[PDB]
Structure formats: C-alpha cells, structure tokens
C-alpha cells in the first residue's frame, strides 16, 4: 500500500455506489443497510466482481481487498456502540440487526464519540469529507 486517488466508474458501478453512500453513511449506519441491501440484491441478481478489463480485474480486486481488509479488522475490533460507521454492515453481511440503536445502548460506555472522532476524522477526510 502506497497510493491514493479516485477513478473508475462504468467498470464497477456497484463499487462507486457503496463508496459514495459509505462516506455519507459515516454518520448513519441504517442508511447503508438500505442502500447496501439494494445494491447487494441488484448485484447478486446480476453479476459479481472480477469484471472489467484484464487490468481492472486485478487492480480492482487488490485495491478493494486492501481497504476492505484494513477496514475489516478495524471495524471488527471497533465495536464503538453509537452509529459510528456503516462500513461494518457492508463489510461482513448486515449490521442492521444490531446498530447504534442496540450497540450504543449497552456499548454506551464509549459511543462513537471517541471512535468516530479519530476514525471518522480519517475515514471521512479520506473519502473527501470536505
């Protein structure tokens, strides 16, 4: 890992979809549950990854795998509580069953206040917070 930039679209529509909604859901997890669920059903009911040209196939898989991997371990060990990041939902399967609602309820001991503080600051500012 040693790059940073945005591009592609027509090749991987689903990617751009989750990407945009991801930066937005950063404030609300539920939002992702709905959006993601939509793209998931549509995608699964259409095609899968490993698409695009012969160069995009690997470049895409690697890239996504890199971020997904890092964010995966982070989100997994995150368990902040309050609607910190929906990345978890689209990360594994669906955190809708238990989001900031119940999570923050008990995990209130340390809501996303702190977690999101640094996490969001980087994640958001990274996706293009503004």
mmCIF file of N, CA and C in Angstrom:
data_model
loop_
_atom_site.group_PDB
_atom_site.id
_atom_site.type_symbol
_atom_site.label_atom_id
_atom_site.label_comp_id
_atom_site.label_asym_id
_atom_site.label_seq_id
_atom_site.Cartn_x
_atom_site.Cartn_y
_atom_site.Cartn_z
ATOM 1 N N UNK A 1 0.806 -1.206 0.000
ATOM 2 C CA UNK A 1 0.000 0.000 0.000
ATOM 3 C C UNK A 1 0.843 1.261 0.000
ATOM 4 N N UNK A 2 0.628 2.114 -0.996
ATOM 5 C CA UNK A 2 1.375 3.362 -1.108
ATOM 6 C C UNK A 2 0.787 4.250 -2.201
ATOM 7 N N UNK A 3 -0.539 4.268 -2.294
ATOM 8 C CA UNK A 3 -1.225 5.076 -3.296
ATOM 9 C C UNK A 3 -2.425 5.793 -2.687
ATOM 10 N N UNK A 4 -3.041 6.674 -3.469
ATOM 11 C CA UNK A 4 -4.202 7.426 -3.006
ATOM 12 C C UNK A 4 -4.794 8.262 -4.136
ATOM 13 N N UNK A 5 -5.973 7.864 -4.607
ATOM 14 C CA UNK A 5 -6.644 8.577 -5.687
ATOM 15 C C UNK A 5 -7.986 7.927 -6.014
ATOM 16 N N UNK A 6 -8.818 8.643 -6.765
ATOM 17 C CA UNK A 6 -10.130 8.136 -7.148
ATOM 18 C C UNK A 6 -10.260 8.057 -8.666
ATOM 19 N N UNK A 7 -11.033 7.084 -9.138
ATOM 20 C CA UNK A 7 -11.240 6.899 -10.570
ATOM 21 C C UNK A 7 -12.178 5.726 -10.837
ATOM 22 N N UNK A 8 -12.291 5.341 -12.104
ATOM 23 C CA UNK A 8 -13.156 4.232 -12.492
ATOM 24 C C UNK A 8 -14.616 4.547 -12.186
ATOM 25 N N UNK A 9 -15.522 3.810 -12.822
ATOM 26 C CA UNK A 9 -16.951 4.011 -12.615
ATOM 27 C C UNK A 9 -17.765 3.026 -13.450
ATOM 28 N N UNK A 10 -17.833 3.279 -14.752
ATOM 29 C CA UNK A 10 -18.578 2.416 -15.661
ATOM 30 C C UNK A 10 -18.175 0.957 -15.478
ATOM 31 N N UNK A 11 -16.907 0.736 -15.146
ATOM 32 C CA UNK A 11 -16.395 -0.613 -14.940
ATOM 33 C C UNK A 11 -17.047 -1.269 -13.728
ATOM 34 N N UNK A 12 -16.943 -0.612 -12.578
ATOM 35 C CA UNK A 12 -17.523 -1.131 -11.345
ATOM 36 C C UNK A 12 -18.514 -0.136 -10.749
ATOM 37 N N UNK A 13 -19.743 -0.159 -11.253
ATOM 38 C CA UNK A 13 -20.784 0.741 -10.771
ATOM 39 C C UNK A 13 -21.071 0.505 -9.292
ATOM 40 N N UNK A 14 -21.290 -0.756 -8.931
ATOM 41 C CA UNK A 14 -21.577 -1.114 -7.547
ATOM 42 C C UNK A 14 -20.541 -0.513 -6.603
ATOM 43 N N UNK A 15 -19.280 -0.551 -7.016
ATOM 44 C CA UNK A 15 -18.193 -0.012 -6.208
ATOM 45 C C UNK A 15 -18.426 1.463 -5.898
ATOM 46 N N UNK A 16 -18.606 2.261 -6.946
ATOM 47 C CA UNK A 16 -18.838 3.691 -6.787
ATOM 48 C C UNK A 16 -20.080 3.949 -5.939
ATOM 49 N N UNK A 17 -21.069 3.070 -6.064
ATOM 50 C CA UNK A 17 -22.309 3.202 -5.309
ATOM 51 C C UNK A 17 -22.052 3.109 -3.809
ATOM 52 N N UNK A 18 -21.450 2.002 -3.386
ATOM 53 C CA UNK A 18 -21.144 1.790 -1.976
ATOM 54 C C UNK A 18 -20.153 2.830 -1.465
ATOM 55 N N UNK A 19 -19.231 3.235 -2.332
ATOM 56 C CA UNK A 19 -18.226 4.226 -1.969
ATOM 57 C C UNK A 19 -18.878 5.540 -1.548
ATOM 58 N N UNK A 20 -19.699 6.097 -2.432
ATOM 59 C CA UNK A 20 -20.373 7.346 -2.133
ATOM 60 C C UNK A 20 -21.244 7.254 -0.895
ATOM 61 N N UNK A 21 -22.115 6.252 -0.860
ATOM 62 C CA UNK A 21 -23.010 6.057 0.275
ATOM 63 C C UNK A 21 -22.220 5.793 1.552
ATOM 64 N N UNK A 22 -21.023 5.235 1.396
ATOM 65 C CA UNK A 22 -20.167 4.933 2.537
ATOM 66 C C UNK A 22 -19.731 6.209 3.249
ATOM 67 N N UNK A 23 -19.270 7.185 2.474
ATOM 68 C CA UNK A 23 -18.823 8.456 3.032
ATOM 69 C C UNK A 23 -19.976 9.192 3.705
ATOM 70 N N UNK A 24 -21.187 8.961 3.208
ATOM 71 C CA UNK A 24 -22.375 9.602 3.761
ATOM 72 C C UNK A 24 -22.876 8.850 4.990
ATOM 73 N N UNK A 25 -22.983 7.532 4.867
ATOM 74 C CA UNK A 25 -23.450 6.697 5.968
ATOM 75 C C UNK A 25 -22.559 6.858 7.195
ATOM 76 N N UNK A 26 -21.355 7.376 6.981
ATOM 77 C CA UNK A 26 -20.408 7.584 8.070
ATOM 78 C C UNK A 26 -21.104 8.160 9.300
ATOM 79 N N UNK A 27 -22.197 8.879 9.072
ATOM 80 C CA UNK A 27 -22.956 9.482 10.162
ATOM 81 C C UNK A 27 -24.117 8.584 10.577
ATOM 82 N N UNK A 28 -24.655 7.838 9.617
ATOM 83 C CA UNK A 28 -25.772 6.938 9.885
ATOM 84 C C UNK A 28 -25.515 5.559 9.285
ATOM 85 N N UNK A 29 -25.619 4.530 10.118
ATOM 86 C CA UNK A 29 -25.399 3.159 9.670
ATOM 87 C C UNK A 29 -26.625 2.623 8.938
ATOM 88 N N UNK A 30 -27.798 2.826 9.530
ATOM 89 C CA UNK A 30 -29.045 2.361 8.934
ATOM 90 C C UNK A 30 -29.111 2.730 7.455
ATOM 91 N N UNK A 31 -28.731 3.965 7.141
ATOM 92 C CA UNK A 31 -28.748 4.443 5.764
ATOM 93 C C UNK A 31 -28.060 3.448 4.834
ATOM 94 N N UNK A 32 -26.938 2.901 5.288
ATOM 95 C CA UNK A 32 -26.183 1.936 4.497
ATOM 96 C C UNK A 32 -26.951 0.625 4.360
ATOM 97 N N UNK A 33 -27.570 0.192 5.453
ATOM 98 C CA UNK A 33 -28.339 -1.048 5.456
ATOM 99 C C UNK A 33 -29.320 -1.081 4.288
ATOM 100 N N UNK A 34 -30.006 0.035 4.065
ATOM 101 C CA UNK A 34 -30.976 0.133 2.981
ATOM 102 C C UNK A 34 -30.274 0.205 1.628
ATOM 103 N N UNK A 35 -29.412 1.203 1.466
ATOM 104 C CA UNK A 35 -28.676 1.382 0.221
ATOM 105 C C UNK A 35 -27.917 0.113 -0.150
ATOM 106 N N UNK A 36 -27.056 -0.342 0.755
ATOM 107 C CA UNK A 36 -26.267 -1.546 0.522
ATOM 108 C C UNK A 36 -27.161 -2.710 0.110
ATOM 109 N N UNK A 37 -28.202 -2.960 0.899
ATOM 110 C CA UNK A 37 -29.130 -4.049 0.619
ATOM 111 C C UNK A 37 -29.632 -3.978 -0.820
ATOM 112 N N UNK A 38 -29.871 -2.760 -1.297
ATOM 113 C CA UNK A 38 -30.355 -2.554 -2.657
ATOM 114 C C UNK A 38 -29.309 -2.989 -3.679
ATOM 115 N N UNK A 39 -28.100 -2.455 -3.544
ATOM 116 C CA UNK A 39 -27.011 -2.789 -4.455
ATOM 117 C C UNK A 39 -26.670 -4.273 -4.372
ATOM 118 N N UNK A 40 -26.763 -4.832 -3.169
ATOM 119 C CA UNK A 40 -26.461 -6.242 -2.957
ATOM 120 C C UNK A 40 -27.402 -7.127 -3.769
ATOM 121 N N UNK A 41 -28.702 -6.932 -3.577
ATOM 122 C CA UNK A 41 -29.707 -7.710 -4.291
ATOM 123 C C UNK A 41 -29.558 -7.538 -5.799
ATOM 124 N N UNK A 42 -29.410 -6.292 -6.235
ATOM 125 C CA UNK A 42 -29.260 -5.992 -7.655
ATOM 126 C C UNK A 42 -28.012 -6.661 -8.224
ATOM 127 N N UNK A 43 -26.885 -6.468 -7.547
ATOM 128 C CA UNK A 43 -25.623 -7.051 -7.985
ATOM 129 C C UNK A 43 -25.702 -8.574 -8.003
ATOM 130 N N UNK A 44 -26.063 -9.154 -6.863
ATOM 131 C CA UNK A 44 -26.178 -10.604 -6.746
ATOM 132 C C UNK A 44 -27.165 -11.156 -7.769
ATOM 133 N N UNK A 45 -28.150 -10.342 -8.135
ATOM 134 C CA UNK A 45 -29.157 -10.749 -9.107
ATOM 135 C C UNK A 45 -28.743 -10.349 -10.520
ATOM 136 N N UNK A 46 -27.473 -9.993 -10.679
ATOM 137 C CA UNK A 46 -26.949 -9.586 -11.978
ATOM 138 C C UNK A 46 -25.595 -10.235 -12.246
ATOM 139 N N UNK A 47 -24.547 -9.664 -11.659
ATOM 140 C CA UNK A 47 -23.196 -10.187 -11.833
ATOM 141 C C UNK A 47 -22.394 -10.057 -10.543
ATOM 142 N N UNK A 48 -21.102 -10.358 -10.623
ATOM 143 C CA UNK A 48 -20.224 -10.276 -9.461
ATOM 144 C C UNK A 48 -18.926 -9.555 -9.810
ATOM 145 N N UNK A 49 -17.959 -9.616 -8.902
ATOM 146 C CA UNK A 49 -16.670 -8.965 -9.113
ATOM 147 C C UNK A 49 -15.881 -9.667 -10.213
ATOM 148 N N UNK A 50 -14.584 -9.382 -10.276
ATOM 149 C CA UNK A 50 -13.717 -9.985 -11.282
ATOM 150 C C UNK A 50 -14.136 -9.559 -12.686
ATOM 151 N N UNK A 51 -14.844 -8.436 -12.771
ATOM 152 C CA UNK A 51 -15.307 -7.921 -14.054
ATOM 153 C C UNK A 51 -14.323 -6.901 -14.618
ATOM 154 N N UNK A 52 -14.782 -6.117 -15.588
ATOM 155 C CA UNK A 52 -13.941 -5.101 -16.212
ATOM 156 C C UNK A 52 -12.868 -5.745 -17.084
ATOM 157 N N UNK A 53 -11.959 -4.922 -17.598
ATOM 158 C CA UNK A 53 -10.878 -5.409 -18.447
ATOM 159 C C UNK A 53 -10.012 -6.419 -17.700
ATOM 160 N N UNK A 54 -8.879 -6.773 -18.295
ATOM 161 C CA UNK A 54 -7.961 -7.730 -17.685
ATOM 162 C C UNK A 54 -7.080 -7.050 -16.642
ATOM 163 N N UNK A 55 -6.946 -5.732 -16.756
ATOM 164 C CA UNK A 55 -6.130 -4.964 -15.824
ATOM 165 C C UNK A 55 -6.961 -4.492 -14.635
ATOM 166 N N UNK A 56 -8.215 -4.142 -14.899
ATOM 167 C CA UNK A 56 -9.115 -3.671 -13.854
ATOM 168 C C UNK A 56 -9.475 -4.802 -12.895
ATOM 169 N N UNK A 57 -9.565 -6.016 -13.429
ATOM 170 C CA UNK A 57 -9.903 -7.182 -12.623
ATOM 171 C C UNK A 57 -9.011 -7.276 -11.390
ATOM 172 N N UNK A 58 -7.694 -7.380 -11.618
ATOM 173 C CA UNK A 58 -6.709 -7.478 -10.536
ATOM 174 C C UNK A 58 -6.571 -6.174 -9.759
ATOM 175 N N UNK A 59 -6.365 -5.078 -10.484
ATOM 176 C CA UNK A 59 -6.218 -3.768 -9.861
ATOM 177 C C UNK A 59 -7.382 -3.471 -8.921
ATOM 178 N N UNK A 60 -8.585 -3.846 -9.343
ATOM 179 C CA UNK A 60 -9.781 -3.621 -8.539
ATOM 180 C C UNK A 60 -9.807 -4.552 -7.331
ATOM 181 N N UNK A 61 -9.633 -5.846 -7.584
ATOM 182 C CA UNK A 61 -9.637 -6.840 -6.517
ATOM 183 C C UNK A 61 -8.608 -6.495 -5.446
ATOM 184 N N UNK A 62 -7.376 -6.240 -5.876
ATOM 185 C CA UNK A 62 -6.301 -5.897 -4.954
ATOM 186 C C UNK A 62 -6.662 -4.664 -4.131
ATOM 187 N N UNK A 63 -6.953 -3.566 -4.818
ATOM 188 C CA UNK A 63 -7.313 -2.319 -4.152
ATOM 189 C C UNK A 63 -8.415 -2.550 -3.124
ATOM 190 N N UNK A 64 -9.579 -2.978 -3.600
ATOM 191 C CA UNK A 64 -10.715 -3.238 -2.723
ATOM 192 C C UNK A 64 -10.322 -4.166 -1.577
ATOM 193 N N UNK A 65 -9.579 -5.218 -1.904
ATOM 194 C CA UNK A 65 -9.136 -6.180 -0.900
ATOM 195 C C UNK A 65 -8.266 -5.505 0.155
ATOM 196 N N UNK A 66 -7.452 -4.549 -0.280
ATOM 197 C CA UNK A 66 -6.570 -3.825 0.626
ATOM 198 C C UNK A 66 -7.368 -3.014 1.640
ATOM 199 N N UNK A 67 -8.226 -2.131 1.139
ATOM 200 C CA UNK A 67 -9.052 -1.293 2.001
ATOM 201 C C UNK A 67 -10.019 -2.141 2.820
ATOM 202 N N UNK A 68 -10.733 -3.036 2.144
ATOM 203 C CA UNK A 68 -11.692 -3.909 2.810
ATOM 204 C C UNK A 68 -11.028 -4.676 3.950
ATOM 205 N N UNK A 69 -9.817 -5.163 3.702
ATOM 206 C CA UNK A 69 -9.072 -5.914 4.705
ATOM 207 C C UNK A 69 -8.768 -5.045 5.921
ATOM 208 N N UNK A 70 -8.134 -3.901 5.682
ATOM 209 C CA UNK A 70 -7.787 -2.980 6.758
ATOM 210 C C UNK A 70 -9.034 -2.536 7.517
ATOM 211 N N UNK A 71 -10.026 -2.049 6.780
ATOM 212 C CA UNK A 71 -11.273 -1.589 7.383
ATOM 213 C C UNK A 71 -11.994 -2.736 8.084
ATOM 214 N N UNK A 72 -11.816 -3.945 7.563
ATOM 215 C CA UNK A 72 -12.450 -5.125 8.140
ATOM 216 C C UNK A 72 -11.976 -5.351 9.574
ATOM 217 N N UNK A 73 -10.661 -5.429 9.751
ATOM 218 C CA UNK A 73 -10.080 -5.644 11.070
ATOM 219 C C UNK A 73 -10.417 -4.489 12.008
ATOM 220 N N UNK A 74 -10.404 -3.274 11.471
ATOM 221 C CA UNK A 74 -10.707 -2.086 12.261
ATOM 222 C C UNK A 74 -12.167 -2.085 12.703
ATOM 223 N N UNK A 75 -13.069 -2.287 11.748
ATOM 224 C CA UNK A 75 -14.498 -2.308 12.038
ATOM 225 C C UNK A 75 -14.844 -3.453 12.986
ATOM 226 N N UNK A 76 -14.214 -4.603 12.771
ATOM 227 C CA UNK A 76 -14.451 -5.774 13.608
ATOM 228 C C UNK A 76 -14.080 -5.495 15.060
ATOM 229 N N UNK A 77 -12.870 -4.984 15.268
ATOM 230 C CA UNK A 77 -12.393 -4.674 16.611
ATOM 231 C C UNK A 77 -12.883 -3.300 17.057
ATOM 232 N N UNK A 78 -13.681 -2.657 16.210
ATOM 233 C CA UNK A 78 -14.215 -1.337 16.516
ATOM 234 C C UNK A 78 -15.214 -1.408 17.669
ATOM 235 N N UNK A 79 -16.369 -2.008 17.407
ATOM 236 C CA UNK A 79 -17.407 -2.142 18.422
ATOM 237 C C UNK A 79 -17.506 -0.882 19.276
ATOM 238 N N UNK A 80 -17.694 0.268 18.614
ATOM 239 C CA UNK A 80 -17.813 1.562 19.292
ATOM 240 C C UNK A 80 -19.114 1.689 20.078
ATOM 241 N N UNK A 81 -20.227 1.368 19.426
ATOM 242 C CA UNK A 81 -21.520 1.452 20.080
ATOM 243 C C UNK A 81 -22.513 2.288 19.297
ATOM 244 N N UNK A 82 -22.289 3.598 19.270
ATOM 245 C CA UNK A 82 -23.174 4.509 18.554
ATOM 246 C C UNK A 82 -22.881 4.486 17.056
ATOM 247 N N UNK A 83 -23.893 4.809 16.256
ATOM 248 C CA UNK A 83 -23.745 4.824 14.806
ATOM 249 C C UNK A 83 -22.409 5.438 14.402
ATOM 250 N N UNK A 84 -21.342 4.655 14.529
ATOM 251 C CA UNK A 84 -20.006 5.121 14.174
ATOM 252 C C UNK A 84 -19.800 5.086 12.664
ATOM 253 N N UNK A 85 -19.796 3.882 12.101
ATOM 254 C CA UNK A 85 -19.610 3.711 10.665
ATOM 255 C C UNK A 85 -20.372 2.491 10.159
ATOM 256 N N UNK A 86 -21.102 2.668 9.062
ATOM 257 C CA UNK A 86 -21.878 1.582 8.477
ATOM 258 C C UNK A 86 -20.974 0.594 7.746
ATOM 259 N N UNK A 87 -19.709 0.966 7.584
ATOM 260 C CA UNK A 87 -18.743 0.112 6.901
ATOM 261 C C UNK A 87 -18.854 -1.330 7.384
ATOM 262 N N UNK A 88 -19.233 -1.498 8.648
ATOM 263 C CA UNK A 88 -19.376 -2.825 9.233
ATOM 264 C C UNK A 88 -20.461 -3.625 8.524
ATOM 265 N N UNK A 89 -21.587 -2.973 8.250
ATOM 266 C CA UNK A 89 -22.703 -3.625 7.573
ATOM 267 C C UNK A 89 -22.273 -4.161 6.212
ATOM 268 N N UNK A 90 -21.716 -3.283 5.384
ATOM 269 C CA UNK A 90 -21.266 -3.668 4.051
ATOM 270 C C UNK A 90 -19.964 -4.459 4.124
ATOM 271 N N UNK A 91 -19.328 -4.432 5.290
ATOM 272 C CA UNK A 91 -18.073 -5.147 5.493
ATOM 273 C C UNK A 91 -18.305 -6.654 5.534
ATOM 274 N N UNK A 92 -19.041 -7.107 6.544
ATOM 275 C CA UNK A 92 -19.340 -8.526 6.697
ATOM 276 C C UNK A 92 -20.600 -8.902 5.923
ATOM 277 N N UNK A 93 -21.755 -8.708 6.552
ATOM 278 C CA UNK A 93 -23.030 -9.026 5.921
ATOM 279 C C UNK A 93 -24.025 -7.884 6.096
ATOM 280 N N UNK A 94 -24.542 -7.738 7.313
ATOM 281 C CA UNK A 94 -25.505 -6.684 7.613
ATOM 282 C C UNK A 94 -25.600 -6.447 9.117
ATOM 283 N N UNK A 95 -25.151 -5.277 9.557
ATOM 284 C CA UNK A 95 -25.186 -4.925 10.972
ATOM 285 C C UNK A 95 -26.544 -4.348 11.356
ATOM 286 N N UNK A 96 -27.449 -4.281 10.386
ATOM 287 C CA UNK A 96 -28.787 -3.752 10.624
ATOM 288 C C UNK A 96 -29.426 -4.417 11.839
ATOM 289 N N UNK A 97 -29.225 -5.725 11.964
ATOM 290 C CA UNK A 97 -29.785 -6.479 13.080
ATOM 291 C C UNK A 97 -29.401 -5.843 14.413
ATOM 292 N N UNK A 98 -28.239 -5.198 14.442
ATOM 293 C CA UNK A 98 -27.756 -4.546 15.653
ATOM 294 C C UNK A 98 -26.822 -3.388 15.319
ATOM 295 N N UNK A 99 -27.368 -2.175 15.322
ATOM 296 C CA UNK A 99 -26.584 -0.985 15.016
ATOM 297 C C UNK A 99 -26.514 -0.056 16.224
ATOM 298 N N UNK A 100 -26.106 1.187 15.984
ATOM 299 C CA UNK A 100 -26.002 2.154 17.060
ATOM 300 C C UNK A 100 -27.149 2.051 18.046
ATOM 301 N N UNK A 101 -28.323 1.675 17.549
ATOM 302 C CA UNK A 101 -29.503 1.539 18.393
ATOM 303 C C UNK A 101 -29.202 0.673 19.613
ATOM 304 N N UNK A 102 -28.953 -0.611 19.374
ATOM 305 C CA UNK A 102 -28.650 -1.543 20.453
ATOM 306 C C UNK A 102 -27.187 -1.445 20.872
ATOM 307 N N UNK A 103 -26.303 -1.327 19.887
ATOM 308 C CA UNK A 103 -24.873 -1.222 20.152
ATOM 309 C C UNK A 103 -24.585 -0.113 21.159
ATOM 310 N N UNK A 104 -24.946 1.114 20.799
ATOM 311 C CA UNK A 104 -24.729 2.261 21.673
ATOM 312 C C UNK A 104 -25.483 2.092 22.989
ATOM 313 N N UNK A 105 -26.612 1.392 22.932
ATOM 314 C CA UNK A 105 -27.426 1.159 24.120
ATOM 315 C C UNK A 105 -26.578 0.600 25.258
ATOM 316 N N UNK A 106 -25.912 -0.521 25.000
ATOM 317 C CA UNK A 106 -25.067 -1.156 26.005
ATOM 318 C C UNK A 106 -23.636 -0.634 25.922
ATOM 319 N N UNK A 107 -23.120 -0.528 24.702
ATOM 320 C CA UNK A 107 -21.762 -0.039 24.485
ATOM 321 C C UNK A 107 -21.666 1.451 24.791
ATOM 322 N N UNK A 108 -22.786 2.042 25.195
ATOM 323 C CA UNK A 108 -22.828 3.462 25.521
ATOM 324 C C UNK A 108 -21.590 3.882 26.306
ATOM 325 N N UNK A 109 -20.981 2.926 26.996
ATOM 326 C CA UNK A 109 -19.787 3.197 27.789
ATOM 327 C C UNK A 109 -18.761 3.982 26.977
ATOM 328 N N UNK A 110 -18.812 3.823 25.658
ATOM 329 C CA UNK A 110 -17.888 4.514 24.768
ATOM 330 C C UNK A 110 -18.462 4.629 23.361
ATOM 331 N N UNK A 111 -19.524 5.415 23.222
ATOM 332 C CA UNK A 111 -20.166 5.610 21.928
ATOM 333 C C UNK A 111 -19.140 5.980 20.862
ATOM 334 N N UNK A 112 -19.608 6.154 19.631
ATOM 335 C CA UNK A 112 -18.731 6.507 18.521
ATOM 336 C C UNK A 112 -18.026 7.835 18.785
ATOM 337 N N UNK A 113 -18.495 8.554 19.800
ATOM 338 C CA UNK A 113 -17.909 9.841 20.158
ATOM 339 C C UNK A 113 -16.393 9.813 19.998
ATOM 340 N N UNK A 114 -15.748 8.878 20.687
ATOM 341 C CA UNK A 114 -14.297 8.744 20.620
ATOM 342 C C UNK A 114 -13.873 8.005 19.355
ATOM 343 N N UNK A 115 -14.431 6.815 19.156
ATOM 344 C CA UNK A 115 -14.108 6.006 17.986
ATOM 345 C C UNK A 115 -14.267 6.817 16.703
ATOM 346 N N UNK A 116 -15.486 7.280 16.450
ATOM 347 C CA UNK A 116 -15.773 8.069 15.259
ATOM 348 C C UNK A 116 -14.894 9.316 15.207
ATOM 349 N N UNK A 117 -14.630 9.896 16.374
ATOM 350 C CA UNK A 117 -13.803 11.093 16.460
ATOM 351 C C UNK A 117 -12.557 10.958 15.589
ATOM 352 N N UNK A 118 -11.720 9.976 15.912
ATOM 353 C CA UNK A 118 -10.494 9.738 15.160
ATOM 354 C C UNK A 118 -10.783 8.957 13.882
ATOM 355 N N UNK A 119 -11.519 7.859 14.018
ATOM 356 C CA UNK A 119 -11.864 7.024 12.875
ATOM 357 C C UNK A 119 -12.518 7.852 11.773
ATOM 358 N N UNK A 120 -13.649 8.471 12.098
ATOM 359 C CA UNK A 120 -14.373 9.293 11.136
ATOM 360 C C UNK A 120 -13.481 10.391 10.569
ATOM 361 N N UNK A 121 -12.749 11.066 11.448
ATOM 362 C CA UNK A 121 -11.854 12.139 11.033
ATOM 363 C C UNK A 121 -10.975 11.695 9.869
ATOM 364 N N UNK A 122 -10.417 10.495 9.980
ATOM 365 C CA UNK A 122 -9.553 9.953 8.939
ATOM 366 C C UNK A 122 -10.377 9.405 7.777
ATOM 367 N N UNK A 123 -11.261 8.461 8.082
ATOM 368 C CA UNK A 123 -12.111 7.853 7.065
ATOM 369 C C UNK A 123 -12.814 8.923 6.233
ATOM 370 N N UNK A 124 -13.553 9.798 6.908
ATOM 371 C CA UNK A 124 -14.274 10.869 6.232
ATOM 372 C C UNK A 124 -13.325 11.743 5.419
ATOM 373 N N UNK A 125 -12.411 12.419 6.110
ATOM 374 C CA UNK A 125 -11.447 13.290 5.452
ATOM 375 C C UNK A 125 -10.761 12.568 4.294
ATOM 376 N N UNK A 126 -10.731 11.241 4.369
ATOM 377 C CA UNK A 126 -10.107 10.431 3.329
ATOM 378 C C UNK A 126 -11.024 10.302 2.117
ATOM 379 N N UNK A 127 -12.281 9.946 2.366
ATOM 380 C CA UNK A 127 -13.257 9.789 1.295
ATOM 381 C C UNK A 127 -13.587 11.136 0.657
ATOM 382 N N UNK A 128 -13.205 12.215 1.335
ATOM 383 C CA UNK A 128 -13.469 13.546 0.821
ATOM 384 C C UNK A 128 -14.473 14.305 1.666
ATOM 385 N N UNK A 129 -14.355 14.173 2.983
ATOM 386 C CA UNK A 129 -15.261 14.850 3.903
ATOM 387 C C UNK A 129 -15.583 16.258 3.410
ATOM 388 N N UNK A 130 -14.555 17.094 3.307
ATOM 389 C CA UNK A 130 -14.749 18.457 2.849
ATOM 390 C C UNK A 130 -14.116 19.475 3.775
#
